[PDB]
Design an enzyme around this catalytic site. Sequence first.
Site, short mmCIF file in Angstrom:
data_model
loop_
_atom_site.label_atom_id
_atom_site.label_comp_id
_atom_site.label_asym_id
_atom_site.label_seq_id
_atom_site.Cartn_x
_atom_site.Cartn_y
_atom_site.Cartn_z
CE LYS A 7 -4.33 -1.46 0.24
NZ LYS A 7 -5.08 -0.88 1.41
C1 LIG Z 1 -6.25 16.86 3.73
C2 LIG Z 1 -4.97 16.31 3.14
C3 LIG Z 1 -3.88 16.08 4.15
C4 LIG Z 1 -4.79 16.05 1.85
C5 LIG Z 1 -5.82 16.27 0.77
C6 LIG Z 1 -5.30 15.82 -0.57
C7 LIG Z 1 -5.38 14.32 -0.71
C8 LIG Z 1 -4.03 13.63 -0.67
C9 LIG Z 1 -6.56 13.66 -0.85
C10 LIG Z 1 -6.71 12.17 -1.00
C11 LIG Z 1 -8.17 11.77 -1.16
C12 LIG Z 1 -8.38 10.29 -1.34
C13 LIG Z 1 -8.90 9.60 -0.11
C14 LIG Z 1 -8.12 9.67 -2.52
C15 LIG Z 1 -8.32 8.20 -2.78
C16 LIG Z 1 -7.04 7.47 -3.19
C17 LIG Z 1 -7.21 5.98 -3.16
C18 LIG Z 1 -7.49 5.38 -4.52
C19 LIG Z 1 -7.11 5.26 -2.02
C20 LIG Z 1 -7.27 3.77 -1.90
O1 LIG Z 1 -7.11 3.39 -0.53
P1 LIG Z 1 -7.90 2.11 -0.03
O2 LIG Z 1 -7.55 1.97 1.46
O3 LIG Z 1 -7.59 0.85 -0.79
O4 LIG Z 1 -9.42 2.49 -0.13
P2 LIG Z 1 -10.73 1.70 0.17
O5 LIG Z 1 -10.47 0.31 0.67
O6 LIG Z 1 -11.48 2.58 1.20
O7 LIG Z 1 -11.47 1.76 -1.18
#
Ligand SMILES: CC(C)=CCC/C(C)=C/CC/C(C)=C/CC/C(C)=C/COP(=O)(O)OP(=O)(O)O
Lengths: 314, 346
Positions: A110
């Site tokens: 990850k």
């Molecule tokens: C506020 C701050 C510090 C930053 C804002 C700017 C950013 C980096 C935003 C990121 C938003 C975000 C959550 C994007 C998703 C990226 C992604 C594909 C994550 C996959 O992670 P997993 O843990 O596998 O997700 P799930 O299992 O929940 O689907």
Amino acid sequence: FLSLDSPTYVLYRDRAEWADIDPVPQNDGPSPVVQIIYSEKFRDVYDYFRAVLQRDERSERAFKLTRDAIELNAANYTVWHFRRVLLRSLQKDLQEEMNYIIAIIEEQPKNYQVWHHRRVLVEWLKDPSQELEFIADILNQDAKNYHAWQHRQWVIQEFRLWDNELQYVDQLLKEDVRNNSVWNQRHFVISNTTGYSDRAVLEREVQYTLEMIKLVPHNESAWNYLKGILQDRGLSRYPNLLNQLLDLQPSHSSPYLIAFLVDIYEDMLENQCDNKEDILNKALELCEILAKEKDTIRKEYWRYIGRSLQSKHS
Amino acid sequence: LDFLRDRHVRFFQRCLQVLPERYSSLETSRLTIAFFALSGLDMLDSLDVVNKDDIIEWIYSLQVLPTEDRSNLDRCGFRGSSYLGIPFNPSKNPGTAHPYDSGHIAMTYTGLSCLIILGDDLSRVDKEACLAGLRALQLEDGSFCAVPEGSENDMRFVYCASCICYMLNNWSGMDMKKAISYIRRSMSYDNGLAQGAGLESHGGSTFCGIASLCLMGKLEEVFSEKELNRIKRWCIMRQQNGYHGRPNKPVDTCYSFWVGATLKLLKIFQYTNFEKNRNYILSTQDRLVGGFAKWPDSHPDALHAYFGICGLSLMEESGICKVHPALNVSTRTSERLRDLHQSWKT
Ligand SMILES: CC(C)=CCC/C(C)=C/CC/C(C)=C/CC/C(C)=C/COP(=O)(O)OP(=O)(O)O
Ligand SMILES: [Cl-]
Ligand SMILES: [Zn+2]
């Protein structure tokens, strides 16, 4: 070489080969915020890493030092960048680095920096022969790892390796028809090869999806794919579809099906169809069915959709 | 059950203090941990429990200023921490050359954001340098990288770029036309927005895309009504009780903000089920140490504590300021930023 947990491990500050270097400490100033406490061993490795970095020393000892820095913290992008600089400067065996990164990623699938490092290596070597199999192994421990699917799409597109992906997709959909990542991959392969304009392909796909829906009717992914490949062609332009779906309502019903029907009726209204006022009621009837009993958590949403249909077609 | 406000205030206070070595992997992104804690306290109207002046100096010591010869403009912005060993300097003297010292887009973003939250006026921020650094990060396809040395590029950084341009109230930091193009091309066949073209749409990237367009004030202009309806449908389908990030994946507290905020920007959050969402968020609350976790009976962290609170804020939880859905700061802070922008315009 000398492992961080070896009985005979020696701090860098006590190594003869490092006597000429003056370690560089980190300083957060008077009142530090979100300060992390570091062990002697940890601080020692990074105090020397800072030294080597500050002088941009492209040495073999620095290269070995990064191995330790990475073991202590694989999320430090600067360390990975410097390691790449060294990889080039010392003209290191990249095939060996591939083995290294392959192990690291397996332990931290990850981490963004490790996947980026591997991609740079593959670009350098212009060799994707190991990729599809490596990714399939990672996807075997976590079939939805976003990093893995992303790397997989990059490799396939960059080196045009489309030949066996649709088969790989068919295999994974059998293992778990609910994996949204695999349905996305399917559309990725098809739209980048044959496309969907070939009526024979569209029919094969629509037929395939309905088969999957019949196996597990409550699967948003399958329904999204089905609607996805048809929505732009015009859902109302497929008369047999409307009827085949209406025939599923009896047994294989689900909020996804109901919604689809509503979307079909709306496409019709959008295309000045026959019995406008009658179709509209068939739609509103379904919206209320969704709100009152099939997708109650979205009660207010469906009612909102309904009100939208009326104020648009009356 | 109920919201343990005081407990969460202490939780955020501890985040700003000292952490056990097991958190070493957060070293290069300590500034965003600070953001979560500071913005979290702000959201709970408790910024008084911290020394705004000390923190402001620390933040400024993280700014990568241009050198005397201004030959490192393409690398200016903010660092996540002081791991490089550069001598402490709260943006006083000019920049001290270093082969590998440069800013990180997510840090430049959270840094500026923190400064505003703490009341600073940004006078010590070399605005032109940051914008110069920002431009250097944009790729041909319109998306952004995090650091000039090269890194992964995706929607997350497009949002960061947007927030920076918005706060510095100057969009010369990016080629908006190309960024918008990137955002459009990320829309999936299922109608959500992904990290990039062809990838699986995700709640996080959908927020980043939609929020970026709102910050640019071009939501309506970029997506047709039909398109926005399809996106709204995709987003509202994410609620199960709490919200998940993508179809067929378990819910996670942070999506109550990521997806919830998107719904708010699309003006249909009002049609979601509040009680089930609130109940889920609270079920991930750590009643002993404070903060929130992604799942119930899971360990809390600064990120989920902040977003769980912002999620609650979306429904106007008693005791929590209203969050600005696109800027990711309290409306109070967004208002202060408006004032700040006005004062400059003289
Ligand atoms: C506020 C701050 C510090 C930053 C804002 C700017 C950013 C980096 C935003 C990121 C938003 C975000 C959550 C994007 C998703 C990226 C992604 C594909 C994550 C996959 O992670 P997993 O843990 O596998 O997700 P799930 O299992 O929940 O689907
Ligand atoms: Cl709303
Ligand atoms: Zn989360």
